[PDB]
Amino acid sequence: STGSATTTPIDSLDDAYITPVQIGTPAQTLNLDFDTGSSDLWVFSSETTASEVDGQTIYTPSKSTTAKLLSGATWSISYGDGSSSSGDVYTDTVSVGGLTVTGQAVESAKKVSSSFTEDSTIDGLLGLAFSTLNTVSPTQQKTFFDNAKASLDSPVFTADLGYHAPGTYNFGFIDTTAYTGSITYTAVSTKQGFWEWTSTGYAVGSGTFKSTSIDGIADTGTTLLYLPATVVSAYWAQVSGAKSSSSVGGYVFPCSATLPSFTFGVGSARIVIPGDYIDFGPISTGSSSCFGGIQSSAGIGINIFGDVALKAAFVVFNGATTPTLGFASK
Ligand SMILES: CSC[C@H](NC(=O)[C@H](Cc1ccccc1)OC(=O)N1CCC(N)CC1)C(=O)N[C@@H](CC1CCCCC1)[C@@H](O)COc1ccncc1
Numbered sequence: 001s002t003g004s005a006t007t008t009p010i011d012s013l014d015d016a017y018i019t020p021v022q023i024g025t026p027a028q029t030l031n032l033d034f035d036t037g038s039s040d041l042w043v044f045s046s047e048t049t050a051s052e053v054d055g056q057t058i059y060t061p062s063k064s065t066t067a068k069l070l071s072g073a074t075w076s077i078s079y080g081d082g083s084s085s086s087g088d089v090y091t092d093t094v095s096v097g098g099l100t101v102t103g104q105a106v107e108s109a110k111k112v113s114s115s116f117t118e119d120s121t122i123d124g125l126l127g128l129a130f131s132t133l134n135t136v137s138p139t140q141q142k143t144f145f146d147n148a149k150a151s152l153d154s155p156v157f158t159a160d161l162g163y164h165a166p167g168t169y170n171f172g173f174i175d176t177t178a179y180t181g182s183i184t185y186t187a188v189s190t191k192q193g194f195w196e197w198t199s200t201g202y203a204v205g206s207g208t209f210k211s212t213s214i215d216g217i218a219d220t221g222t223t224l225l226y227l228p229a230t231v232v233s234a235y236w237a238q239v240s241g242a243k244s245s246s247s248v249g250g251y252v253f254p255c256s257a258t259l260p261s262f263t264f265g266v267g268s269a270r271i272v273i274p275g276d277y278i279d280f281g282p283i284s285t286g287s288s289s290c291f292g293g294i295q296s297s298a299g300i301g302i303n304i305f306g307d308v309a310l311k312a313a314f315v316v317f318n319g320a321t322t323p324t325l326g327f328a329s330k
Contacts, residue, residue: 001151002172003099007034007161010121013281014307015223017161018121019169022095023106024064030057030123034169035221036159036195036317037304039133039143040077041094042085042107043124044116052112055120061108067092075107075135080222080300084113089136094144096126099171101148105134105141125221128157128317133193145171145319155319159220160330161311163277179314179328184269188323195219195317197325199305200267202227204235205260209270216303218310218317218325224280225262225273226297226304235262235294242292248283255282255290262294264309266327273312 007019018031023043030043044056061067073089087110094104109124116122127134131142149155152172160178161167168178189196199214214227232251236242238260242253253259259275278293293308316326 001099001148002153002170003095003097003148004168004170005097007167007169009162009164009166010119012164014161014164014311016122017167017220017307018123019096019126021126023059024061024092025066026064027095028057028059028064030059031121032124032126033122033221034126034128034159035219036128037217037219037221038077038079038125039127039129039131039193040075040107040135041105041124041126041144042075042077042087042109044112045087045108047087048109049111052114052117054117057123059106059108059124061090061092061106064092066102067106070105070136070139073136073139073141075137077135081115082113083115084111085109085116086111089141096144096171097169099148099152101144104144104147105136107136107141128220129195130190130193132190148172149319157317157319159310159315159317161220161307163274163311167311174316179330181329182269183314183316183326183328184266185316185318185324185326186267188318188325190323195323195325200265202231202265203263203270204238207238209263209265211265214264214303216297216305218315219304219306220310222304222306223293223308224304224306225278225294225308226300226302226306227294228303229296229298232294232296235260236292244296245289248289248291250295251292252283252289253292255288257290264305269327271309271313271327271329273309277308277312 280291
């Protein structure tokens with residue numbers, strides 16, 4: 001079997017992407033954020049404290065005939081954002097772009113952080129990291145991908161995120177028309193439960209490629225690109241007026257500036273991120289200072305290849321026995 005769903009930016013900055021997901025019987029369509037950096041499938045629901053809901057579409061288990069309470073099960077999650085959510089657990093039928101999974105753990109939120117309440121376009125998350133990170137207790141649950149794996153034509157899913165445009169999440173097959181040239185595969189470490197890999201180096205603009213090992217994770221659920229202080233400093237040193245601001249918490253640059261591209265290595269291949277992708281607009285309405293899409297990971301503890309990098313490529317997540325990550329230009 002296979003599945004294919006269109007994913008759409010939530011705003012003109014591509015801060016995040018939402019993908020319609022059908023839950024229950026009859027179907028209840030919610031717009032979820034596909035997150036390869038987490039392993040929980042959670043949604044706003046009829047159980048969420050009324051004051052914490054503001055415009056989101058909610059899942060109503062009582063209206064679904066295939067929903068079943070998972071007695072005693074609970075969940076609690078806190079994101080690198082500081083964001084937090086918690087609640088109880090149901091099992092129900094979930095379909096993504098035609099691909100159906102029965103008995104999928106659907107985590108119903110009772111409490112959500114203000115950050116979530118304020119975000120009316122996101123109805124919940126769909127975790128696509130490894131099941132070892134799932135927070136359901138006392139019985140850990142499997143991810144949607146894990147549950148569909150067997151039925152898939154190939155144990156893979158691909159991410160084709162657009163720049164200021166819709167993209168595609170495919171399950172079970174590789175669209176050979178979606179990319180140019182060849183796909184370069186690279187080893188993945190599952191030790192921490194992430195799609196963790198090692199980049200072979202980088203280049204700024206038309207500069208010399210620097211061969212250096214960069215260990216990080218492929219994370220669709222993170223907007224920006226977080227790299228080591230040394231790499232980030234070398235990038236922004238090429239932008240006049242750019243500086244690290246303590247007040248805004250990161251590198252900012254004069255909106256009138258032209259950003260150089262950034263190249264990251266995948267084995268012997270190279271992926272180029274156009275400079276335009278690295279511009280995240282004014283720090284505040286009317287400001288002439290703009291926010292940079294490449295920031296330091298120093299305080300995070302891990303390098304993150306977020307949307308900024310992923311959207312420059314066609315990305316294959318191969319969930320085979322020996323998982324790999326495939327990168328192609330497009
Ligand atoms: C450096 S992890 C911070 C990161 N959250 C972001 O990237 C958010 C995403 C967002 C959400 C809602 C609207 C707009 C953007 O966006 C921004 O933080 N920014 C974009 C706007 C830019 N101008 C301001 C900075 C993060 O927790 N991701 C997790 C998923 C995320 C949680 C919040 C809801 C949406 C999904 C997740 O994958 C983290 O996995 C790991 C985290 C830490 N170790 C390893 C893996």
